[PDB]
Amino acid sequence: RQVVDDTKYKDYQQVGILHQHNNSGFVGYLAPTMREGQAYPANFPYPLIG
Amino acid sequence: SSARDDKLTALLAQLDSLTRELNVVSQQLLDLRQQVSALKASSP
């Protein structure tokens, strides 16, 4: 597999679970519940292609 | 007997702290190198 080079990347930011908003506004926070939050551009999985 | 284990654990903690400091130093180093490259980029 491929992962983000935490050193060589220019703007690497170690983001914990408590701050990954992907699929926001449509999934519960840190647990399967009702949808929570607002829609927003995501911030997590780092693109490794494109 | 547990004194040696205490010293070894202290050694591991010191190594971890040293690794963290080394990583942050390397990060500052990369930042400085990139900044210098950008500054020298505009000159020619």
CSV table of all heavy atoms in Angstrom, one decimal, chain B residues 3-35:
chain,number,residue,atom,x,y,z
B,3,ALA,N,15.8,-1.6,40.3
B,3,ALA,CA,16.5,-0.3,40.0
B,3,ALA,C,17.0,-0.3,38.6
B,3,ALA,O,16.9,0.7,37.9
B,3,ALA,CB,17.7,-0.1,41.0
B,4,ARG,N,17.6,-1.5,38.1
B,4,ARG,CA,18.0,-1.5,36.7
B,4,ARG,C,16.9,-1.4,35.8
B,4,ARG,O,17.0,-0.7,34.7
B,4,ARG,CB,18.7,-2.9,36.5
B,4,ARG,CG,19.2,-3.0,35.1
B,4,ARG,CD,19.7,-4.5,34.8
B,4,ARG,NE,20.8,-4.9,35.6
B,4,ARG,CZ,22.1,-4.9,35.2
B,4,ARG,NH1,22.4,-4.5,33.9
B,4,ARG,NH2,23.1,-5.3,36.0
B,5,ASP,N,15.7,-1.9,36.1
B,5,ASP,CA,14.5,-1.8,35.2
B,5,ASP,C,14.1,-0.3,35.2
B,5,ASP,O,13.6,0.2,34.2
B,5,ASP,CB,13.4,-2.7,35.7
B,5,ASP,CG,13.8,-4.2,35.6
B,5,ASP,OD1,15.0,-4.4,35.2
B,5,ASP,OD2,13.0,-5.0,35.9
B,6,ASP,N,14.1,0.3,36.4
B,6,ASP,CA,13.8,1.8,36.4
B,6,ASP,C,14.7,2.6,35.5
B,6,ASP,O,14.3,3.4,34.8
B,6,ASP,CB,13.9,2.3,37.9
B,6,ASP,CG,12.8,1.6,38.7
B,6,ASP,OD1,11.8,1.2,38.2
B,6,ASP,OD2,13.0,1.6,40.0
B,7,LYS,N,16.0,2.3,35.6
B,7,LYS,CA,17.0,3.0,34.8
B,7,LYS,C,16.7,2.7,33.3
B,7,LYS,O,16.8,3.7,32.5
B,7,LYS,CB,18.4,2.7,35.2
B,7,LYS,CG,18.8,3.2,36.5
B,7,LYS,CD,20.3,3.1,36.8
B,7,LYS,CE,20.7,1.6,36.9
B,7,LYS,NZ,22.2,1.5,37.2
B,8,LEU,N,16.4,1.5,33.0
B,8,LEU,CA,16.1,1.2,31.6
B,8,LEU,C,14.9,1.9,31.1
B,8,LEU,O,14.9,2.4,29.9
B,8,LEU,CB,16.0,-0.4,31.4
B,8,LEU,CG,16.4,-1.0,30.1
B,8,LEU,CD1,17.9,-0.7,29.9
B,8,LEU,CD2,16.1,-2.4,30.1
B,9,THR,N,13.9,1.9,31.9
B,9,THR,CA,12.6,2.6,31.5
B,9,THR,C,12.9,4.1,31.3
B,9,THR,O,12.4,4.7,30.4
B,9,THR,CB,11.6,2.4,32.6
B,9,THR,OG1,11.3,1.0,32.6
B,9,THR,CG2,10.3,3.2,32.2
B,10,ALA,N,13.7,4.7,32.2
B,10,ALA,CA,14.1,6.1,32.0
B,10,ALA,C,14.9,6.3,30.7
B,10,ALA,O,14.7,7.3,30.0
B,10,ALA,CB,15.0,6.5,33.2
B,11,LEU,N,15.7,5.3,30.4
B,11,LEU,CA,16.4,5.4,29.1
B,11,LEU,C,15.5,5.4,27.9
B,11,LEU,O,15.6,6.2,27.0
B,11,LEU,CB,17.4,4.2,29.0
B,11,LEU,CG,18.6,4.3,28.1
B,11,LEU,CD1,19.6,3.1,28.4
B,11,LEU,CD2,18.3,4.3,26.7
B,12,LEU,N,14.5,4.5,28.0
B,12,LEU,CA,13.5,4.5,26.9
B,12,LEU,C,12.7,5.8,26.8
B,12,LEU,O,12.5,6.3,25.7
B,12,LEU,CB,12.5,3.3,27.1
B,12,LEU,CG,13.1,1.9,26.8
B,12,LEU,CD1,12.0,0.9,26.9
B,12,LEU,CD2,13.8,1.9,25.5
B,13,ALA,N,12.3,6.4,28.0
B,13,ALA,CA,11.6,7.6,27.9
B,13,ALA,C,12.5,8.7,27.4
B,13,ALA,O,12.0,9.6,26.6
B,13,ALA,CB,11.2,8.0,29.3
B,14,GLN,N,13.8,8.8,27.7
B,14,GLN,CA,14.7,9.7,27.2
B,14,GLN,C,14.9,9.6,25.7
B,14,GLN,O,14.9,10.6,25.0
B,14,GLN,CB,16.0,9.6,27.9
B,14,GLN,CG,16.1,10.3,29.3
B,14,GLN,CD,16.0,11.8,29.2
B,14,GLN,OE1,16.2,12.4,28.1
B,14,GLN,NE2,15.6,12.4,30.3
B,15,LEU,N,14.9,8.3,25.2
B,15,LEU,CA,15.1,8.1,23.8
B,15,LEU,C,13.8,8.6,23.1
B,15,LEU,O,13.9,9.2,22.0
B,15,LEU,CB,15.3,6.6,23.5
B,15,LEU,CG,16.7,6.1,23.7
B,15,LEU,CD1,16.8,4.7,23.2
B,15,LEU,CD2,17.7,7.0,23.0
B,16,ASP,N,12.6,8.4,23.6
B,16,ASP,CA,11.4,8.8,23.0
B,16,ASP,C,11.4,10.4,22.9
B,16,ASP,O,11.1,10.9,21.9
B,16,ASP,CB,10.2,8.3,23.7
B,16,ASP,CG,8.9,8.9,23.1
B,16,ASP,OD1,8.5,8.5,22.0
B,16,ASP,OD2,8.3,9.8,23.8
B,17,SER,N,11.7,11.0,24.0
B,17,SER,CA,11.8,12.5,24.0
B,17,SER,C,12.8,13.0,23.0
B,17,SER,O,12.5,14.0,22.3
B,17,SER,CB,12.1,13.0,25.4
B,17,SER,OG,13.3,12.5,25.8
B,18,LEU,N,14.0,12.3,22.9
B,18,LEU,CA,15.0,12.7,22.0
B,18,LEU,C,14.5,12.6,20.6
B,18,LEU,O,14.8,13.4,19.7
B,18,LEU,CB,16.2,11.9,22.2
B,18,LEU,CG,17.5,12.3,21.5
B,18,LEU,CD1,17.7,11.7,20.1
B,18,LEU,CD2,17.6,13.8,21.5
B,19,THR,N,13.8,11.5,20.3
B,19,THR,CA,13.2,11.3,18.9
B,19,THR,C,12.2,12.4,18.6
B,19,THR,O,12.2,12.9,17.5
B,19,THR,CB,12.6,9.9,18.8
B,19,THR,OG1,13.4,8.9,19.6
B,19,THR,CG2,12.5,9.5,17.4
B,20,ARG,N,11.4,12.7,19.5
B,20,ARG,CA,10.4,13.8,19.3
B,20,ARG,C,11.1,15.1,18.9
B,20,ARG,O,10.8,15.8,18.0
B,20,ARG,CB,9.5,14.0,20.4
B,20,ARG,CG,8.4,12.9,20.6
B,20,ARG,CD,7.9,12.9,22.0
B,20,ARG,NE,8.0,14.2,22.6
B,20,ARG,CZ,7.8,14.4,23.9
B,20,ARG,NH1,7.5,13.4,24.7
B,20,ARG,NH2,7.9,15.6,24.4
B,21,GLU,N,12.1,15.5,19.8
B,21,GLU,CA,12.9,16.7,19.5
B,21,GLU,C,13.6,16.6,18.2
B,21,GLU,O,13.6,17.6,17.4
B,21,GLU,CB,13.8,17.0,20.6
B,21,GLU,CG,14.6,18.3,20.6
B,21,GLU,CD,13.7,19.5,21.0
B,21,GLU,OE1,12.5,19.2,21.4
B,21,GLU,OE2,14.2,20.6,21.1
B,22,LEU,N,14.2,15.5,17.8
B,22,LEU,CA,14.8,15.4,16.5
B,22,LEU,C,13.9,15.6,15.4
B,22,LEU,O,14.2,16.2,14.4
B,22,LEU,CB,15.5,14.0,16.5
B,22,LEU,CG,16.3,13.8,15.2
B,22,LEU,CD1,17.6,14.6,15.3
B,22,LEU,CD2,16.7,12.3,15.0
B,23,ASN,N,12.7,15.0,15.5
B,23,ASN,CA,11.7,15.1,14.5
B,23,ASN,C,11.3,16.6,14.3
B,23,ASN,O,11.2,17.1,13.2
B,23,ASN,CB,10.5,14.3,14.7
B,23,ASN,CG,10.7,12.8,14.5
B,23,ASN,OD1,10.6,12.3,13.4
B,23,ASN,ND2,11.1,12.1,15.5
B,24,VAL,N,11.0,17.3,15.4
B,24,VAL,CA,10.6,18.7,15.2
B,24,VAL,C,11.8,19.5,14.7
B,24,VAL,O,11.6,20.5,13.9
B,24,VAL,CB,10.1,19.3,16.6
B,24,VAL,CG1,9.0,18.4,17.1
B,24,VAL,CG2,11.2,19.5,17.6
B,25,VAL,N,13.0,19.2,15.0
B,25,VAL,CA,14.2,19.9,14.4
B,25,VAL,C,14.2,19.7,12.9
B,25,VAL,O,14.5,20.6,12.2
B,25,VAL,CB,15.5,19.5,15.1
B,25,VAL,CG1,16.7,19.9,14.3
B,25,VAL,CG2,15.5,20.1,16.5
B,26,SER,N,14.0,18.4,12.5
B,26,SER,CA,14.0,18.1,11.1
B,26,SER,C,12.9,18.8,10.4
B,26,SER,O,13.1,19.3,9.2
B,26,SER,CB,13.9,16.6,10.9
B,26,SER,OG,12.7,16.1,11.5
B,27,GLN,N,11.7,19.0,11.0
B,27,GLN,CA,10.7,19.7,10.4
B,27,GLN,C,11.0,21.2,10.2
B,27,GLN,O,10.8,21.8,9.1
B,27,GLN,CB,9.4,19.6,11.2
B,27,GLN,CG,8.7,18.3,11.2
B,27,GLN,CD,8.2,17.9,9.8
B,27,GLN,OE1,7.9,18.8,9.0
B,27,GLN,NE2,8.2,16.6,9.5
B,28,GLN,N,11.6,21.8,11.2
B,28,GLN,CA,12.1,23.2,11.1
B,28,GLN,C,13.1,23.3,10.0
B,28,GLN,O,13.2,24.2,9.2
B,28,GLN,CB,12.7,23.7,12.4
B,28,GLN,CG,12.9,25.2,12.4
B,28,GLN,CD,14.3,25.7,12.8
B,28,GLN,OE1,15.2,25.0,12.5
B,28,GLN,NE2,14.4,26.8,13.4
B,29,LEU,N,14.0,22.2,9.9
B,29,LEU,CA,15.0,22.2,8.9
B,29,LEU,C,14.4,22.2,7.5
B,29,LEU,O,14.9,23.0,6.6
B,29,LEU,CB,15.9,21.0,9.1
B,29,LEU,CG,17.3,21.0,8.5
B,29,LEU,CD1,17.3,20.5,7.0
B,29,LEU,CD2,17.9,22.4,8.5
B,30,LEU,N,13.5,21.4,7.2
B,30,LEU,CA,12.8,21.3,5.9
B,30,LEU,C,12.1,22.6,5.6
B,30,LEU,O,12.2,23.1,4.5
B,30,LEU,CB,11.8,20.2,5.9
B,30,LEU,CG,12.4,18.8,5.4
B,30,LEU,CD1,11.2,17.8,5.2
B,30,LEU,CD2,13.2,19.0,4.1
B,31,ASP,N,11.5,23.2,6.6
B,31,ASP,CA,10.8,24.5,6.4
B,31,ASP,C,11.8,25.6,6.0
B,31,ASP,O,11.6,26.3,5.0
B,31,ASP,CB,10.1,25.0,7.7
B,31,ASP,CG,9.4,26.3,7.5
B,31,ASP,OD1,9.1,26.7,6.3
B,31,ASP,OD2,9.0,26.9,8.5
B,32,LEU,N,13.0,25.6,6.7
B,32,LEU,CA,14.0,26.6,6.3
B,32,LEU,C,14.6,26.4,4.9
B,32,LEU,O,14.8,27.3,4.2
B,32,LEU,CB,15.1,26.6,7.3
B,32,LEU,CG,16.1,27.8,7.2
B,32,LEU,CD1,15.4,29.1,7.6
B,32,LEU,CD2,17.4,27.5,8.0
B,33,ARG,N,14.8,25.1,4.6
B,33,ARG,CA,15.4,24.8,3.3
B,33,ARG,C,14.4,25.2,2.2
B,33,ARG,O,14.8,25.8,1.2
B,33,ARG,CB,15.7,23.3,3.1
B,33,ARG,CG,16.4,22.9,1.8
B,33,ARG,CD,15.4,22.4,0.8
B,33,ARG,NE,15.9,22.3,-0.5
B,33,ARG,CZ,16.6,21.3,-1.0
B,33,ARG,NH1,16.9,20.3,-0.2
B,33,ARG,NH2,17.1,21.4,-2.2
B,34,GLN,N,13.1,24.9,2.3
B,34,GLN,CA,12.1,25.3,1.3
B,34,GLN,C,12.0,26.8,1.2
B,34,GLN,O,11.9,27.3,0.1
B,34,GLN,CB,10.8,24.7,1.7
B,34,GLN,CG,9.7,25.0,0.7
B,34,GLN,CD,8.4,24.4,1.2
B,34,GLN,OE1,7.4,24.3,0.4
B,34,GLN,NE2,8.3,24.0,2.4
B,35,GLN,N,12.1,27.5,2.4
B,35,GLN,CA,12.0,28.9,2.3
B,35,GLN,C,13.2,29.5,1.6
B,35,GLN,O,13.0,30.5,0.8
B,35,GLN,CB,11.9,29.5,3.7
B,35,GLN,CG,11.2,30.8,3.8
B,35,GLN,CD,9.7,30.7,3.9
B,35,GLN,OE1,9.0,31.7,4.1
B,35,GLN,NE2,9.2,29.5,3.8
